[model samples]
Target: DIVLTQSPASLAVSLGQRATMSCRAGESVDIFGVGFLHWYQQKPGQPPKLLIYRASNLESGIPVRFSGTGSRTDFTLIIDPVEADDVATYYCQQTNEDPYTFGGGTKLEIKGGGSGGGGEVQLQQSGAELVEPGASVKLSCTASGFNIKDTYMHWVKQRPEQGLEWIGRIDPANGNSKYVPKFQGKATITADTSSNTAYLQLTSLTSEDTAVYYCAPFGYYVSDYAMAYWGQGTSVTVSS
Candidate 1:
């Protein structure tokens, strides 16, 4: 297990004050001939969105204010000034090995300045709720007191009215893995082995993503295994 930590437990930023977050790995996770580190942003009730991958490259459709840098054991996620729409938690991860993990997130609150730290913020398990075929849901998980980058943290789904769904999960240190057919074009699973955290992204944001979201230990088969270690579930409700 890899250990991950964040600074400024919370950040109170003005509309344009840059907010930066960091993630560190215990060791190097060699993959596809290179070390792969990643980053994510989670807005309340929305899925964990990808921000940075491979240390510094931005994921497809991400904003420019969001940028990442560093290598091997240390990496950073920088959001210039910040955006009202960007008010949320940001996390860092390493995709170098199994049992991927994530860092405690840095909440970027937009305080217009009145007193000092007037922005009432709440830190709870990250999750959401969905309604139906049209319900778009989002979820996230952060691990603590453990070595994050050395193992794999996985994401699973449970429909309150249905059962468990296996979405794909990325190795926290190396970001290499596979996904289920149902999740192929609809969702994404990522782990920050450095932070001992894992994340899930259900794109269409429908009732499908509405189930209870979990961040669990990604255990595999000694000879074809099943996901067993589990995180307490975070529920997301989807509605207009």
Candidate 2:
């Protein structure tokens, strides 16, 4: 497993200025001739969208302002001339090996307070859960500084060497959830307005079910929505 440390957890830059953050891997992330480090941007209440893949290759729909450069254990994610609407948390992920990891997350904000910083919202989830094959596990996630019901809550999975994958989402305000095809039968999502918490239940677990699960909320992201806030992530392992 490669541990990723992101510097300057949060930064405030003026509009049209450069915003850069560093990601250091606990071990070299270069394999073959490619850098497995990639970048994603998450606006408040939106799902994280892939920005740069293989360190420097920009995703098809991603703006050119977003770019990545670095190799081995060192990597950087840069938002050149940040846009007013670019106030979001940016993350780097390394997938060269198993247990692909994500940076702690670098939060970007407009310097002049167009999107003023209030007590930043935080998501709290359990540290780890170990379950046996065929068993079920419930991972709980709670929020502080903001009510979960006011937004849309979603869950994503990061398998061993893969990047983020959307599993399903729940509208905390309504207890309604929609799963991503295959996950429908394996996952269950629930939320509690009073507790400001959300839950993801995995049934019929298998080794393939072993991965890191993240709880996030989504809202308006550009023209659509993406995952915004994120819990550090809960590690779930299923073994016989």
Candidate 3:
């Protein structure tokens, strides 16, 4: 698995100033003839939001002021004339391997300590899951401090020493579900707004399925979809 290291643990920026964060990959993040680097922002008590994908492609609805660049092992996320709302932690991830990984993250603070009020959002997830291979495991996430009935829920996986992989998500408003092509049959993603919870059912689990899983509230912006708040994460170990 490739490792991502971010520089400058924190930064203090004035409103309308520029904040730059850098990510260094342990290995080339280019996969299948394309760069797999992605950037995300996570505010306190909120899920991560994708700002850049495939290295430099800006996610839809993202402000023009936010940008990314570079390739191979060196990459960067830039917020020019950063807004007050942009104060948060930034992370970099790579999808070039089976087990994805992420950078430690960089925290951005408003120079004058701006009032960052957006209401709290919390994801309460299940505990460690121990199941035998070939058996299915059911994982869950309960959302709070937000309108769970109206927000979309998504599942992500991170194998030991690996990065994160998008498993899929469920739309609470319509009960519609979508899965990553790679996980379509191997896993099932569902949600229950009535209980403010989301579920992930994995069938025919193998040793390869041992990993930490996270559930997050999903956000949509034009053509881009991102996790706006994440659960603490659940560790699943398949054995015997």
Candidate 4:
């Protein structure tokens, strides 16, 4: 698995000073000729905002002062002349490998006063699974510190050295689910609110289905955002 290590767990900067968060990837995340990394800014109770996509291109409409730099194994998100409003946690993620690993996050704090963000939550999975081709497997993800009774939970797929793909999500309250056209019929998603667990099952799987599978919640406030806190992921290895 590719790992992303962030520095200075937390930072305190003056109102007009520059704040930069660093991310060092365990391996080069450069795909083809460009870095396959992205940057995000997240505030409490909200989904992450995409600040930089593909390493350096600022997301359209995001402030110019918020930028990304670096490639290969090291990357940085720079917030110049940090403002009070810029106080939030930042994350760096690489899509060049399976699992689409993310940094632990760097929280920007105002040196003089006020706050930066909120508490953290976690998602758990029961390790990885190895399945024979043409077989089926049920994957489960449980949420801690929160409830699944009123929201939707999604599944994400990351193919080795490929990129990211959204599998689908299920509503715990209604049992209703949706899938990406390519994954429809190939995947089954359901949830058990009583156990705070959501499930995904694959049908007649092949090696093509091999990858790191993740479960995520809070990516929406009944709306969509770029990225949400994700499970460490269950490694699915489809083989002979």
Candidate 5:
């Protein structure tokens, strides 16, 4: 798997000016006839929004002004005539491997005022848990600093020494859920708007399930959804 490194911890851009960010991959990100590099924008108290995918394809509803271009080991995200609403942190990710990896992130500052600018989103997740094989584990995440009923919540896992893996997500508005094929039968994701908390239930836990889990807010862009805000993460250990 390739590692992505982003540069320029932060940048300031004036209205109508061009803002550019860079992402360097540890190795070529092209595979199976396509580039796996993707870009996202994350605003305070919200989930990351997908901006570019498959290297340069603009996600649905994204403005044409927000674009990306690059290949192999180098990539760039460009925003022309930057808008105040564009002020946020940007990240690059690679999906060519089993465990996806993301860039450290870049923060964009607008010279003038920007929309959706404010304090950080807070996600209160469950603490670590120890469970035995064949047992089930239930986890929870409570969100604050935002209207939990208006957004979607997702679950992710990171086994020791591995990258991030998408488990599933639930839409609090309708109680709808979606999961990656790999996690479909292994886990169950649910949400409770009454308490503003999301839950993850893992069945038949095994040593291989030992890892850190996180509940994040979801951002809907173009045709799909991406994780925008994240919780600190809970550790899960499966042993005898």
Candidate 6:
């Protein structure tokens, strides 16, 4: 598994000011003869949306205010004249290997501290136990040594009975949350940065939610379809 780290730990930029985030990988991950790289923006309560992929390729319908650059092991996410709506944390991801890893995160504030530096993002494990199908399971992850910016924290479902069901995730750094649409009524995600932790609460747990549970930071990059630096998946048995 490859590890990731970020820089500047924080930044101080005013509205309309430009901001940039960097992602460094432990090794090279070449995808289909190209450097597989991507970036994302996570606000509170929402799912992470794609911004850039394939290093510099912009996702369709993204704001022109966002742009990406760089290559290979070194990549960057740039925002021009940051907007109040853009005052969320950002993350970088690479799908070049198994157990993808995400950068700690860069927080983009509106007035107060501005864009502060970043730290090594972490996915601290929370207490989990067995829950029968139709029951509920709640899992949590606290981020430390990092800002936990408006970055989206995800909890993926690995159902041994089926396969992978993109459950859902939360954006504590911002406040907006989202689900896979199919998972809207069945799953819920929440976060409390004060404790630097995010939660993945599964309602009506079925045999499907009985796989490995991992919490990861979400980015707007293309590589994001896959997970970045996964948490040691927490196993929750949904059997009687």
| TM-score for each predicted model, relative to the true structure | 0.44, 0.50, 0.50, 0.50, 0.50, 0.48
Winner of 5 and 6 under TM-score: 5
Error of 3 at 202 (Å): 0.7
Estimate, for each residue in 1-240, the C-alpha lDDT of model 5 and write its tens digit. 778999888887765579889999998888765789999999877899998998899999897888888878899999985643566899999997857899989988765434544434578888889888998998999976554555668889999899999888888878889999989999999888888888999999889899999988765321124455779999999989
lDDT for each candidate structure: 0.63, 0.81, 0.80, 0.80, 0.81, 0.69
lDDT of 2 by residue, 200-223 (tens): 999999999999999887742211
Summed over model 6, clashes come to: 36
lDDT of 2: 0.81
On the 0 to 100 scale, the lDDT of residue 32 in model 6 is 62
Deviation in Å, model 6, residue 66 alpha carbon: 18
Quality of model 6 by C-alpha lDDT: 0.69
In the range 5-113, model 3's lDDT, one tens digit per residue, is: 9988988876456888899998999866568999999988888999889888899988788888877899988888665356688999999885899899998876644
lDDT of 5: 0.81
For all predictions, the C-alpha RMSD in Å is 18.4, 15.3, 15.6, 15.7, 14.6, 13.6
Give the clash total for candidate 5.
6
Candidate 6 residue lDDT tens string, 1-240: 877676656655654568877888888755665767778777766677788877778899786778777666777778875644565667777788878777877866655242342333356766657888678877887765334554567778776666666667776657778889988887788888777777887788776567777887665321134554567767888786
137 Cα displacement, candidate 6 (Å) = 1.4
RMSD of 2: 15.3
lDDT digits (tens) for residues 101-204 of candidate 4: 98999987766454423334478976898998998888999975445654579999999987889999888877889999998999999888889898989899
Which pairs of residues collide in candidate 2? 45-218, 45-219, 46-226, 46-227, 46-228, 47-226, 47-227
Query: What stretches of model 2 exceed 4 Å from their correct place?
Result: 1-117, 220-225
